Paper text:
Each enzyme has a catalytic center with evolutionarily conserved histidine and asparagine (aspartate for HHAT) residues that are embedded deeply within the ER membrane.
The structure contains an additional density corresponding to one [name] molecule bound to each [name] protomer. The positioning of [name] in acyl-CoA binding tunnel is consistent with previous results showing that the drug competes with the acyl-CoA substrate for enzyme binding. [name] interacts with [name] through both hydrophobic and polar interactions. For the bulky region of [name] that inserts into the fatty acid binding tunnel, the oxygen atom connecting C14 and C15 and the tertiary amine linking the C13 and C14 position form hydrogen bonds with the evolutionarily conserved residue Ser411. Furthermore, the bulky region (7,7-dimethyl-7H-pyrimido(4,5-b)oxazin-4-amine) that links to the cyclohexylbenzene moiety interacts with the catalytic residues His415 and Asn378 through hydrophobic interactions.
Numbering used by the authors:
A (entry chain B), B (entry chain A): 66 to 228, 239 to 481
Write the structure that this text describes.
C-alpha cells in the first residue's frame, strides 16, 4: 500500500494536536529533581513543631494581640445576622422590602467594617490584614449569593402556592449555612453535589503539593525578587515612566513565576484539599485559561468561582432588568476592579488606584488582542499580557510597601 | 436548574483533559523574552558574513584540507553503484542472486569505508567526522530501503507477468534517486506525496528557529557544561562507580536540556525546512513521545523515520521468514545499538562500548517501567529514564574526549 501520508508535524502551527499532558509532567519531575533534597530537609526541620495547638492557645489567651484572627471570627455575627433575617423572612415576618433593606445593611457592614478596623488599628500586620479582608470579601460574595438564591426559591414557592433533594424552606439550618460558608464556591445552591469518600491518598498528595509549593514560592521571593528590589530602592510613587518601566521589566518574570506557582497552590491544592475534606464533588475551579486565544476567554476560565458568581449574580440579574448589555458588562468589570483595589490597597493603606486601572484596562486590551492577534499568536499575546499586564499592579503595591518599611 | 456538576480539576491525575497547547507557547514566549536581545545582536553580528560561497571556494581550491566534505561527496559513487546494479537488474542482467550479492558488497562498503577513512586519517575533526559518518549511515539505510522496495516491485511485476502514479521500472531515473537521497525519510516508496507550494513564510520561520536554537544550544553548552566539566577534570575511564555517578548527576540536567533543544532543532526545524524546500508533504517525523507512559511507546514515536525503517525493513521482513518474534525484536534492538555505537565512538576513536550498553539496557528498562509504574507515574518514570538513561552515554563519550584534548 502506502507508508507516506500527507500530514503535518505535531508542533506545527496548524496541526491541531493539543495533547501535551507530558509537558506538565516534565515540569513536575524537573521541579522535584531540583528541589526535593531541600524540601525533605526543610520538611524534617519544620514538621517537628506543634504549631496549631500552641498558637491557638497563645491566641485564646490574649484576644487582642492578633486582631486579624479576631476579625475572622467576628464575621460570624454577620453570617448569623443574614441567617436570622432569612429565617424570619421565610416564616413570614419582615416583608420582602424590609428583608432586602436589612440584607443590604448587613452586606455594607461586612464590607465597610474591616476596612475601618484595619485602617484605625496600627497593631495589625499586612498579611494578617489581607487574610482578614479576603475572608470578609469571600463572606460578602457568599452571603450575596445566599440572599439571591433564597429570594428566587421563596418567590417560586409563593408563585406555586397560587396553583433526596431539598425544597426551599427546609434548608435553612445552621449546618447548611456553615457548610456553604466553607465550601469552595461563591455560588449558593440547594443540594450541593457530594463525593463518595475522603480518599486519604488524594488529600495527602494535595497537602504535599501545598507544602512543596510554599517552599518553592518562598525561595523564589527571597532569592530572586528581594535581591532585585534591593538593587535600586526607589518607590514607584515618584519615578518617571522610563524608570518605572525599566524596573518592572526586570521584576516581571520572577513575579510571573510566583503568580503561576500561587495559582497552582491555591486553585488546585488549597481548594482541592478543602473540597476533599468536606466532600464537595464539583472540584472545577479553573479551566484551560492557558490555551486562551483572547483576553475575554481568559477571564471566563481563570478563577471559575468568582466568574460564575459574577455571571449569575451581577450580569444576568442585570440583563433581566435590561440595562444595555454593554453597560452591564462594564458594571461587572467595575465591580471586579473595585474588589481587586479594595483587597490589595487597604491592607497596605495605599490608595494609588493601580489594580483598579489594570482591571479597567482589561477592556481595551481585550479589544486589541482580539482584533489584531489570532490563533497561537493571540495566545502568545495573552501570555505577554499576563507577564506585564494586571499582576504588575499588585507587584507595584507590594514593592512600594517594602521599599518604605525595610 | 443546576450550577454545580460533579467533575474534576483539569490538572487532576484522573480528569483526562490533555489540551496543553499553551504550555509550549509559554515556553516559546519565555525563551524569546529571555534571549531575543542576544539573538538579534548575534544575528546582526554573524549575518554580515558571506560564508557559503567563500567556504566552498576555499574547499574546491584544496580538496585535501577538508576530508569530511570529501567523504560526503565520495558517497555518491556508492549511490551511483547501487543505481547501476538496480538498472541492470531491471533490464534483466545480473540475475537476482548476483544482484543481492552486489548490493550487499556495496552496502558493506558504505559502512566500512568511512570508518577506515576516519580511523586512518589524523587531519580530520570530530564534528566533521561525525557528520561524514552520519551522512554515510543515512545513505546506507536509504539504499537498503531502495533495494528492498525495488526487489518487491520487481517480483510483483514478474508474478503479474504470468497472468499520475508510477509503475515499477519507470521510476529508475537519476532524478528519482537523488530526490529520494535528500528526502527526510529513510523509507523508499514510489510516488512520494507532495505539497502544493513552498510557503516562504513557513521556511522563514523554520530557518529562524534553526538559528535561534543554535544560539541557545551554544549558550547552554558554553555556560553550563564546559564550566561544570572543568570543575573536576577526570576521565570516566578510571573513576569508580561512586565518582562517575556523582559527576553525571551534576551533568545530567544541562545535558537533558541540550537534548530537548537538539530534538526540536533537528526533527522539527531542519527536517521541516528540508521537506518544505522540496515539497515532501509527509512532514511527520515524530509523535507524542512526551506523553508516553511506557518505554516501548517512547521508541515507537521518537524518531519516526528510523523507526518505520526498522519496522518495515528489519522486523516485519524477519517475521515473514518467521524467526521467533522475540528474537527478531532483539535483533532490531541489536542493530540499533550497533549503529548508535558506530556513530558516537568512531569519530572519537573511543571503543568503550557505552551507547551499545544503553540501547541494550532499553529492554530490561522497558520491562521494568511497564510492570511497575503506570499512568502519569509511568510517564514520570520515562522522563526520569530520559534524564539519566541513554543520552548519558553520548555525554560520557564527549566528556571523556574533551577531558583528554583540552
Ligand atoms: C472581570 C471579572 C468580573 O473579574 C474577575 N475577577 C476574577 N476572576 C474572574 N474570572 C473574573 N471575571 C470577570 C468577568 C466576568 C464576566 C465576564 C463576561 C464576559 C463575556 C460577556 C459576554 C460576551 O460579550 O460574550 C459577559 C461578561 C467577563 C469577565
Ligand atoms: C530500538 C530501535 C530500533 O532504535 C531506534 N533508534 C532510533 N529511533 C527509534 N525510534 C528507534 N526505535 C527502535 C525500535 C524499533 C522497533 C520497535 C518495535 C517495538 C514493538 C515490538 C512489538 C511489540 O512487542 O508490541 C516490535 C519492535 C521498538 C524499538
Amino acid at each position: 500500500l502506502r507508508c507516506h501520508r500527507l500530514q503535518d508535524s505535531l508542533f506545527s502551527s496548524d496541526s491541531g494536536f493539543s495533547n501535551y499532558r507530558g509537558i506538565l509532567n516534565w515540569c513536575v519531575v524537573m521541579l522535584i529533581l531540583s528541589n526535593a533534597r531541600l524540601f525533605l530537609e526543610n520538611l524534617i526541620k519544620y514538621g517537628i513543631l506543634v504549631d496549631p495547638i500552641q498558637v491557638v492557645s497563645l491566641f485564646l489567651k490574649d484576644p487582642y494581640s492578633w486582631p486579624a484572627p479576631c476579625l475572622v471570627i467576628a464575621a460570624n455575627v454577620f453570617a448569623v445576622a443574614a441567617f436570622q433575617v432569612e429565617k424570619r423572612l421565610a416564616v413570614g415576618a419582615l416583608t420582602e422590602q424590609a428583608g432586602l433593606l436589612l440584607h443590604v445593611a448587613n452586606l455594607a457592614t461586612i464590607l465597610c467594617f474591616p476596612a475601618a478596623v484595619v485602617l484605625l488599628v496600627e497593631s495589625i500586620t499586612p498579611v494578617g490584614s489581607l487574610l482578614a479582608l479576603m475572608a470578609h470579601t469571600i463572606l460578602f460574595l457568599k452571603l450575596f449569593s445566599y440572599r439571591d438564591v433564597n429570594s428566587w426559591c421563596r418567590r417560586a414557592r409563593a408563585k406555586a402556592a397560587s396553583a433526596h433533594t431539598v425544597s426551599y424552606p427546609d434548608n435553612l439550618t445552621y449546618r447548611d449555612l456553615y457548610y456553604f460558608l466553607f465550601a469552595p464556591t461563591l455560588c449558593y445552591e440547594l443540594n450541593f453535589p457530594r463525593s463518595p469518600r475522603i480518599r486519604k491518598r488524594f488529600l495527602l498528595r494535595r497537602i504535599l503539593e501545598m507544602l512543596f509549593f510554599t517552599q518553592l514560592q518562598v525561595g523564589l521571593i527571597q532569592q530572586w525578587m528581594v535581591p532585585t528590589i534591593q538593587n535600586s530602592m526607589k518607590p514607584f510613587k515618584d519615578m518617571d515612566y522610563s524608570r518605572i518601566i525599566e524596573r518592572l521589566l526586570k521584576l516581571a518574570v520572577p513575579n510571573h513565576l510566583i503568580w503561576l506557582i500561587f495559582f497552582y497552590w491555591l486553585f488546585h491544592s488549597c481548594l482541592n484539599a478543602v473540597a476533599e475534606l468536606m466532600q464537595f464533588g464539583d472540584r472545577e475551579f479553573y479551566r484551560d485559561w492557558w490555551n486562551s486565544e483572547s483576553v475575554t476567554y481568559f477571564w471566563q476560565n481563570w478563577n471559575i468561582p468568582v466568574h460564575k458568581w459574577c455571571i449569575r449574580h451581577f450580569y444576568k440579574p442585570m440583563l433581566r432588568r435590561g440595562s444595555s448589555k454593554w453597560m452591564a458588562r462594564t458594571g461587572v468589570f467595575l465591580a471586579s476592579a473595585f474588589f481587586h483595589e479594595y483587597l490589595v490597597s487597604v491592607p497596605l493603606r495605599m490608595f494609588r488606584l493601580w489594580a483598579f486601572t489594570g482591571m479597567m484596562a482589561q477592556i481595551p486590551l481585550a479589544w486589541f488582542v482580539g482584533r489584531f492577534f489570532q490563533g497561537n499568536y493571540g495566545n502568545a499575546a495573552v501570555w505577554l499580557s499576563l507577564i506585564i499586564g494586571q499582576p504588575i499592579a499588585v507587584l507595584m503595591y507590594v514593592h512600594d510597601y517594602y521599599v518604605l518599611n525595610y
